[PDB]
Write an enzyme that holds these catalytic residues in place. Structure first.
Site, PDB file in Angstrom:
ATOM      1  N   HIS A 175       0.768  -1.244   0.000  1.00  0.00           N
ATOM      2  CA  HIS A 175       0.000   0.000   0.000  1.00  0.00           C
ATOM      3  C   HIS A 175       0.785   1.272   0.000  1.00  0.00           C
ATOM      4  O   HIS A 175       0.209   2.334   0.009  1.00  0.00           O
ATOM      5  CB  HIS A 175      -0.937   0.059   1.186  1.00  0.00           C
ATOM      6  CG  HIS A 175      -2.113  -0.843   1.057  1.00  0.00           C
ATOM      7  ND1 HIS A 175      -3.266  -0.674   1.789  1.00  0.00           N
ATOM      8  CD2 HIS A 175      -2.325  -1.917   0.259  1.00  0.00           C
ATOM      9  CE1 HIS A 175      -4.141  -1.601   1.441  1.00  0.00           C
ATOM     10  NE2 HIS A 175      -3.593  -2.369   0.513  1.00  0.00           N
ATOM     11  N   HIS A 208      -6.434  -6.310  -8.954  1.00  0.00           N
ATOM     12  CA  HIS A 208      -7.505  -6.442  -7.978  1.00  0.00           C
ATOM     13  C   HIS A 208      -8.809  -5.868  -8.462  1.00  0.00           C
ATOM     14  O   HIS A 208      -8.875  -5.322  -9.535  1.00  0.00           O
ATOM     15  CB  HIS A 208      -7.097  -5.783  -6.657  1.00  0.00           C
ATOM     16  CG  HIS A 208      -6.507  -4.408  -6.811  1.00  0.00           C
ATOM     17  ND1 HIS A 208      -7.278  -3.279  -6.967  1.00  0.00           N
ATOM     18  CD2 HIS A 208      -5.219  -3.994  -6.872  1.00  0.00           C
ATOM     19  CE1 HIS A 208      -6.490  -2.230  -7.122  1.00  0.00           C
ATOM     20  NE2 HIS A 208      -5.237  -2.637  -7.071  1.00  0.00           N
ATOM     21  N   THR A 257     -12.329  -3.404  -8.449  1.00  0.00           N
ATOM     22  CA  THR A 257     -12.455  -1.981  -8.754  1.00  0.00           C
ATOM     23  C   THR A 257     -12.639  -1.077  -7.521  1.00  0.00           C
ATOM     24  O   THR A 257     -12.923  -1.520  -6.418  1.00  0.00           O
ATOM     25  CB  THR A 257     -13.636  -1.708  -9.747  1.00  0.00           C
ATOM     26  OG1 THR A 257     -14.905  -1.868  -9.089  1.00  0.00           O
ATOM     27  CG2 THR A 257     -13.565  -2.651 -10.917  1.00  0.00           C
TER      28      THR A 257
END
Ligand code: CA
Ligand code: CA
Lengths: 485, 143
Positions: A60, A286, A288
């Site tokens: 992240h 991944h 949406t």
């Protein structure tokens, strides 16, 4: 008409690798589905193209958009685009910190190495300039200048490892200072070796045409439904098929929350770029953004690829909403917007607004009994007639489908005034909660519109006189019947 | 969620002439319904027998809360339903019209006649506005 970029100019603003977006034109057309992307770091594009591995949900930390580390995900998030924003850097660093441990062996960190070519791509973009030479403890280094004022960078002549240090008198956002040190970047494991990561392609949304979703329903589960005598169970059974094969989403290990048609779309997309040459693996990793409910971002510009294979790029949120309103949720395609919108996302407290048709109607539609209760629940934060919560349950009684429309309007215009009466004498009591008083003056307003609505459909205060509230039963409902006449 | 529980515990105070939050199975159905659920007499019985094997018939919060603490597992799909409604509502007026119903249908392969269509609308319609609002769409989908 609405001010949006198109073709070349739009692709340019999107950040996607040109070759890649072209391959995407194909899939859009084939599956007849709108593909909407989120902004892509423009300094990441060449890295992506040169085949640098992109990043999954297991990473992240944000990417940089300045300095020698532009495009990569720096371990030290103060070198990222969130530079200077102390709170953000911290969540960034905590994020990397976790990535390195909670996935030990899968995600690591390594020294940044700027090859001869990247230095020039950076020199072009006017991001960093290769400076004067310098020697330290018997090693040759070339400075790298940047219009940054907190840090100073240099690169190694031998292994091309870039290092950085704080400047004299300056302090990090975290209030630090230090001397010379390699710049570490987030890396992943690939056949036992650590390879640097870069931005990936984040889908903002995916809108497939109903027809395209049909192909997702088993030609037997459907026939069974379609072929039902009772329509009331027909609809529901159809709607449930739509929910099951098009709407419903479920959490996946690394692809986050997505549906099955999305998983396929995902695979298709990655396949498309692999065919062109991208050797970094997946470029979409991944689901949406519409399923990112805890920490919903909000971009000014969304890059759209319509089933025609045409490139569009919205200039601003309000615009993004019009484009989706006029060409998607309005033209037979499957779409759902983030559940967090119009609320305070829990994760980042974001409050992103979106146009919800159910609410515009709320004003003229009386409430269900649950909504009534549920609104006494949440209302019971800033802080004995159950007749109303029953009446409201009466107004929406399924055992109505055996009466004529005329009948329906009649009994409902009644059941309404009924609850409009109870709410009335409750407000006629003590103003218990000063602002609970508003919820009712409000309901009463809704009840009023709904009723005055059902009446005009056929033939308020007026008729609210020649009615009973005295004692009780099928005596008031009587005088009523006649009043309508 | 705190509200998930807040709602149930919220209704409990609407119909108890006991004051101790210990209603009977006589009103158990009264509550489960005013709270958006339509249980069958058979279900109100087989459940109030296992968990409430007390032998009194008086249900309080801990008991009622725990019961609901099961149903709201698959039924909570409300979200998808609400999203579904929005799929039908092609003009975003907040209501589902026959015409719109036709579209969702003809596109999903089920070619329908303007006859049968207006028939489905009138089925689900509950107050006779000739259209279906979310509340109705909800009944027609849950009920
Ligand atoms: Ca409509
Ligand atoms: Ca209606």
């Amino acid at each position: 008409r609405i001010d949006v970029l198109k073709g070349e100019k739009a692709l340019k603003a999107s950040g996607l690798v040109p070759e890649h977006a072209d391959a995407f034109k194909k899939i859009a057309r084939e599956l007849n589905t709108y593909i909407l992307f989120r902004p892509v770091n423009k300094l990441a594009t060449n890295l992506i193209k040169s085949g640098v591995a992109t990043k999954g949900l297991n990473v992240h930390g944000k990417s940089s958009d300045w300095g020698p580390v532009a495009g990569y995900i720096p371990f030290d998030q103060d070198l990222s685009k969130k530079h200077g924003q102390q709170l953000a850097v911290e969540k960034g660093n905590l994020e990397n910190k976790k990535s390195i441990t909670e996935h030990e062996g899968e995600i690591g960190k390594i020294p940044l190495k700027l090859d001869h070519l990247r230095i020039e791509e950076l020199k072009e973009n006017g991001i960093i300039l290769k400076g004067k030479k310098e020697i330290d403890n018997g090693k040759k280094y070339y400075l790298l200048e940047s219009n940054n004022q907190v840090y100073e960078f240099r690169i190694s002549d031998e292994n091309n490892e870039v290092q950085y240090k704080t400047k004299e008198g300056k302090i990090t956002v975290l209030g630090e200072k230090f001397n010379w040190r390699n710049i570490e970047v987030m890396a992943k494991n690939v056949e036992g070796v650590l390879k640097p990561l870069t931005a990936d392609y984040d889908l903002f949304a995916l809108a497939p045409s109903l027809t395209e979703i049909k192909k997702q329903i088993p030609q037997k589960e459907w026939d069974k439904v379609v072929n039902t005598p009772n329509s009331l169970e027909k609809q529901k059974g159809v709607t449930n098929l739509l929910i099951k094969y098009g709407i419903e989403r479920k959490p996946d290990s690394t692809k986050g929350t997505l549906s099955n048609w999305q998983k396929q779309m995902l695979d298709r997309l990655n396949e498309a770029v692999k065919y062109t040459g991208y050797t970094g693996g997946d470029v979409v990793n991944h689901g949406t953004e519409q399923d990112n409910e805890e920490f919903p971002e909000k971009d000014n510009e969304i890059f759209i690829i319509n089933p025609e294979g045409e490139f569009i790029l919205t200039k601003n949120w309000e615009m993004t909403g019009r484009f989706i309103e006029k060409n998607i949720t309005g033209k037979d395609y499957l779409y759902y917007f983030n559940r967090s919108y119009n609320k305070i996302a829990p994760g980042n407290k974001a409050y992103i607004e979106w146009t919800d048709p159910i609410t515009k109607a709320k004003i003229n539609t009386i409430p269900t009994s649950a909504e009534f209760i549920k609104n006494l629940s949440s209302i019971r934060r800033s802080s004995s007639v159950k007749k109303i919560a029953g009446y409201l349950s009466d107004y929406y009684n399924s055992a109505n489908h055996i009466f004529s429309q005329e009948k329906k309007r009649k009994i409902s215009i009644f059941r309404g005034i009924q609850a409009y009466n109870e709410i009335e004498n409750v407000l006629k009591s003590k103003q218990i909660a000063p602002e609970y008083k508003n919820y009712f003056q409000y309901l009463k307003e809704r009840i009023t519109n709904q009723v005055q609505l059902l009446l005009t459909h056929q033939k308020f205060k007026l008729l609210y006189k020649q009615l009973n509230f005295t004692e009780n039963e099928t005596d008031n409902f009587e005088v009523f019947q006649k009043i309508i006449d | 969620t705190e509200e998930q529980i807040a709602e149930f515990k919220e209704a409990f105070s609407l119909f108890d002439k006991d004051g101790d939050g210990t209603i009977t199975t006589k009103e158990l159905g009264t509550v489960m319904r005013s709270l958006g659920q339509n249980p069958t007499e058979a279900e109100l019985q087989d459940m109030i027998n296992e968990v409430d094997a007390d032998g009194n018939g008086t249900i309080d919060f801990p008991e009622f809360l725990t019961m609901m603490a099961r149903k709201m597992k698959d039924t909570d799909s409300e979200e998808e339903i609400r999203e579904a409604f929005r799929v039908f509502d092609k003009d975003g007026n907040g209501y589902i019209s026959a015409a719109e119903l036709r579209h969702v249908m003809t596109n999903l392969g089920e070619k329908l006649t303007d006859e049968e269509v207006d028939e489905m609308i009138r089925e689900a319609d509950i107050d006779g506005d000739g259209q279906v609002n979310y509340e109705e769409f909800v009944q027609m989908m849950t009920a």
